[PDB]
Paper text:
The L-arginine biosynthesis pathway consists of eight enzymes that catalyse the conversion of L-glutamate to L-arginine, appears to be attractive target for anti-Tuberculosis (TB) drug discovery. The arginine biosynthesis pathway consists of eight different enzymes ([Fig fig1]) all considered to be essential for *M. tuberculosis* growth *in vitro*. In this work, the ligandability of four enzymes of the pathway ArgB, ArgC, ArgD and ArgF is explored using a fragment-based approach. In conclusion, using a fragment-based approach, we have discovered inhibitors that bind to novel sites in ArgB and ArgF and to the active sites of ArgC and ArgD, which in case of ArgB show on target activity against *M. tuberculosis*.
(A) X-ray crystal structure of ArgC apoenzyme superposed with the NAPD bound holoenzyme. Binding of NAPD causes significant structural changes in two loops of the protein that move from a closed to open conformation ([Fig fig2]). The apoenzyme ArgC with 5% DMSO was found to have a melting temperature of 67.7 °C. While 1 mM NADP^+^ gave a small average positive thermal shift of ~0.6 °C and 1 mM NADPH produced an average negative thermal shift of −0.9 °C across all DSF runs performed.
Numbering used by the authors:
A (entry chain B), B (entry chain A), C (entry chain A), D (entry chain B): 9 to 352
Write the structure that this text describes.
Amino acid sequence: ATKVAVAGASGYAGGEILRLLLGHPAYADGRLRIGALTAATSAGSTLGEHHPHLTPLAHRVVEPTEAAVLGGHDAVFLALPHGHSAVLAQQLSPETLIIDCGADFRLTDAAVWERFYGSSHAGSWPYGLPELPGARDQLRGTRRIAVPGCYPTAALLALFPALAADLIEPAVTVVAVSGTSGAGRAATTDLLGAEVIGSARAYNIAGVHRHTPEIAQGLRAVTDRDVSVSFTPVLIPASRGILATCTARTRSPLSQLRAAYEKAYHAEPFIYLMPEGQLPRTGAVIGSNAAHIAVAVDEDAQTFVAIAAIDNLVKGTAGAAVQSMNLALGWPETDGLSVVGVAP
Amino acid sequence: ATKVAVAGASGYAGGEILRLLLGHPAYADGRLRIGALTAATSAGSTLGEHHPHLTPLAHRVVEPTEAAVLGGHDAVFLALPHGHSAVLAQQLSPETLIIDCGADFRLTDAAVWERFYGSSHAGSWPYGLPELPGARDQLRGTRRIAVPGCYPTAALLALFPALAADLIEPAVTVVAVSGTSGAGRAATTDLLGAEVIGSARAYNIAGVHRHTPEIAQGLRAVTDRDVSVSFTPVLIPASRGILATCTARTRSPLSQLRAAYEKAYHAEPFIYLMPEGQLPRTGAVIGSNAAHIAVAVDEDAQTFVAIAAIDNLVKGTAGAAVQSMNLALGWPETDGLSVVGVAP
Amino acid sequence: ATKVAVAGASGYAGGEILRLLLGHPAYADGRLRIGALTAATSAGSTLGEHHPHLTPLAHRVVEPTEAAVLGGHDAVFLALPHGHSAVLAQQLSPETLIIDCGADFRLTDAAVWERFYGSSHAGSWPYGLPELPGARDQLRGTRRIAVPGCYPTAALLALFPALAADLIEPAVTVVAVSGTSGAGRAATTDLLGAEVIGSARAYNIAGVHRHTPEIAQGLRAVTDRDVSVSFTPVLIPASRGILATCTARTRSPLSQLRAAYEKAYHAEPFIYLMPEGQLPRTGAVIGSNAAHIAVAVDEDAQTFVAIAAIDNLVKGTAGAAVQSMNLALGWPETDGLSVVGVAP
Amino acid sequence: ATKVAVAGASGYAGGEILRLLLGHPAYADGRLRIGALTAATSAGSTLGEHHPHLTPLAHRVVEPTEAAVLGGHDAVFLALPHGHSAVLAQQLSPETLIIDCGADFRLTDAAVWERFYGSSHAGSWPYGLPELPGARDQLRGTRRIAVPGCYPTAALLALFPALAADLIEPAVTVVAVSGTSGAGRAATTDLLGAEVIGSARAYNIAGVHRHTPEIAQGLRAVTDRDVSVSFTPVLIPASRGILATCTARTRSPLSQLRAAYEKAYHAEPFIYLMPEGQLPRTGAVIGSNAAHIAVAVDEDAQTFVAIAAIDNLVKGTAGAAVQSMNLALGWPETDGLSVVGVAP
């Protein structure tokens, strides 16, 4: 069987990975085993003190996050979306399947990495967004997966079919609202319930957010032109969900743009192109690995508009990780991953 | 094979029954098939216009709620929690498994029914709360199920073990907070988002809420003493969840009360007795069919305190319906029903 | 002395006008008196049944919305943001100060009106956004006020200074999140608490939202260039608030753009330019008549970014109405209107 | 003029005190001056970095919380609801007006204090709940005010008129829901937005919550009998508000109970007894100093039911502090304190 460890098990991404593994058919039939669950602090505590929703695992004792603890597993999830896991990954075998939820292996330009993260570039691993052109090929049987950021997932699914078909200009604007679990479980005044409830705020604006070059990198991969990205994230009083509104100038008719999205996504199990007249809502995808997408043309403004809704913790993080895990191990890509949201 | 219809498919309960059926192992292996989906209005619309989270069924055309449309189905969910379905159930073929989410077949006292509902009592069907003493045996192979109300589910699970052991006085007090989906999908000013967000309110207080006699009935089934129930429901700004705080005067040691909960729930997969020092939270059970329960004694006030958390749409409605359906059809009781919540 | 009537008193805008009037210094000293409160339904009910927060007026009996009831008032608020009040305004005595919260008198182009609203253009009244160039002078002593829409208020405050200085291109993009009270108090499934809580959705996208031409009109007033507007509104799980993210292509230094904002807003008491390194939040302006604004430049994307936060019911509706009323009556513009939000 | 200092200015209670002082008529006419604003950490920061809603004070520099800094003021608010301010208060003159939002001077029984707080009893000051029998007398011209806890305020306003008239039994049950600002601004995993949003949980149950003896003390003051209190607090996804549901057995008719509440509250400016048929909602009192109260009798359960809604930060904390300040200084009790909530 495949023995899986989860480093960063007490955080939100780690808890969501474990929820999905508990429901995975390979866990049910014994082909997947949940092994070491580790954290940087609170080793010796039980998982129930961190994730009371995961009652089948409530008695598991959290262990320290160390290469020795993570060795001896066939697959290791590094469930630190805001952490830097290059040092730990360098201690693990190339034949161990490593799935990093953090950013350390996402970027392919060392100069861009140094500017936005202020450290030496660790390299790049196959990007865990199987729906991007060419990405599924790179993931099949890989032993290394860099899971995408949550905002780039929504923006790239909204924009890449139009840009790959050369139907929009390569200067794009993205304004995305997100629930607060995407900021992680570290306690901060600005993430307190009293602060977030009843309020919305943009943050890290005008190109300083580290997901900006990640969006640019994904879009540059489908075009020959210089790509520019205006990316604004907005925190809203929800625990989960990302609704990305993405725009770009266009000279193309809506019929041609719609056909490009139908062609890109008609056989993609997790991407749902809304019927004409319907628009995405994050409530409809919560708990699911689905992305709901709609496209339109603002004739007066000569502007293409694409809306994408995902669950930031599933298709934006842990669901992408499990989906890519399935591809890496040769299991059905959809195993353990529902398209049905938990609404209302 | 069992072909299932859902009447009132466009409401919250009907949408949640459909979510559970889509994830049910008998659906995946072909033994359970989803047939007619009906509503009293909007016949001719598609299901995706009502329940965008249910994308596998998005193209289904909603049909009128009529006996003729519901014929040819082995099981019919009357997913009208606030409706009166005695007239429609009388029109179906009597061999159908009829599962009523509403109240018409819950109560066993005709004078109590007439006082609270203003009509002639129709009778009673096996009560779909399998964990109550004697209930599971009435559900095995039944062709009739009366799904419990959502508040009585939480209150009865919280209180019945202590009362059955005669360890608390039979005058109980229940104050239960509920998310707003329990009030149904009918549009009213008082249920609008702007009104509910940022606000809490008790309603139908001092014994006028129709779940008061339902709680009393379930408790009277476990004791010979005269039972009284003070029940206050409180709407809070959440979409789902019920947290019931239940009290009664006691002079019994806490250890004896805990022993009663252990005897009732040690072999019940959907009831989780919290570890010492932990308390339930509705966010830990959302999406699951579980009830998380904790008990304590206030020695200064000589008061027993029981806290129960459920998802009002799962263990309080649709999950109870599906759990009881499994018993009716001879399928594993837990099929299609998870104990793991979708948190945060 | 000014006796004021409020037509549509039972809606959200009417309730907020009444809250501001009750706190207005002219109400406390006797110069402003609150007269008839009317609605199209529920005549004969009391105001407390509709607006329990307005306890000083709880005993007032709601009257029918009819010209005869509205006679004898020096000022009449037509507090119907989603209504068409041209017919009723024609029935009032022409010397009345008429303050329309709806759209009928906002637009200045008859062909644009007919395209977006499907009817004959009625004309235009002085636009109740005193901070726009030229607007305050049209409001002094007016007997007619067209209150701006809530989204245009935020977008115009965010963008007009940069465009007036010719420092950004005239093709602007606006993505604005809004709490649900902006959609009005009419009960619809899509506005129910269970639906809105935990969810975000864009709506009326790609130029079909009727505030698109209103934003374009306000911007065309400050430039000779051809203006285009891509406007996307997004409903989020809050009762109040609008956060507008506004963008346009620029090659101008940030210091010059900041100078334009300083020139426009240095003497405007309701406009707060954030200190360097701070960004607006809708929770900081709730209950106040203030707009908090920040600007920045994304040099990599050659994009200007302006963020504006307002309370949609105060500076976006009722506070704009009262601010303009003060100008109409010759009272201090700030009377009754606070710059301090109710946070958290 | 009266020079006022606020110790704990960067917390929620301190910010709310300052919001009320900014709107106080004595601040407008110069009779009240806002002096030193202090905090235990972050001295040297500006108030705008902690309370962006308080823009008139945004440039004030936070000073260290020291007796020397607080000396030289005529009145000092100790805005530490969860802190222990006896050591600081002992350094200030008996003629300085000290208003303590914390608990150190609330209790009149040293043995009860030691059991619940684990420290030596500091003494007792006049209790800042002017509506309690005899309390207004004690506050007039005092130089010392112990502001009540937020939950006791709601419970005592709900229960004292019935108990003082000997119309209910002295064993009471209180289940109160509260928004998260009552837990204070200290960053904690369990107070994170992602945790609190979409969830409810009881905490500190079965008599361990320190407000239990505070409720008992207030009730014992109006009766000759042994009082017992079962108090359960429940955290809900709101930033503000307390809805207390309070029950007790009774032999009295509703007409007699209603008359007792009409007599107690008919001349109380901040206490609104709901008209028959209406029930309190916390949304209707947010931002106001009002309490909305309803009473009823559950005939079948022989139980009196009282519901009270307050804003936990205003009538539950800072509004009580300002109301008591007015009484201490001989100013109109209602100065600076609205009864009109900010709804929706």
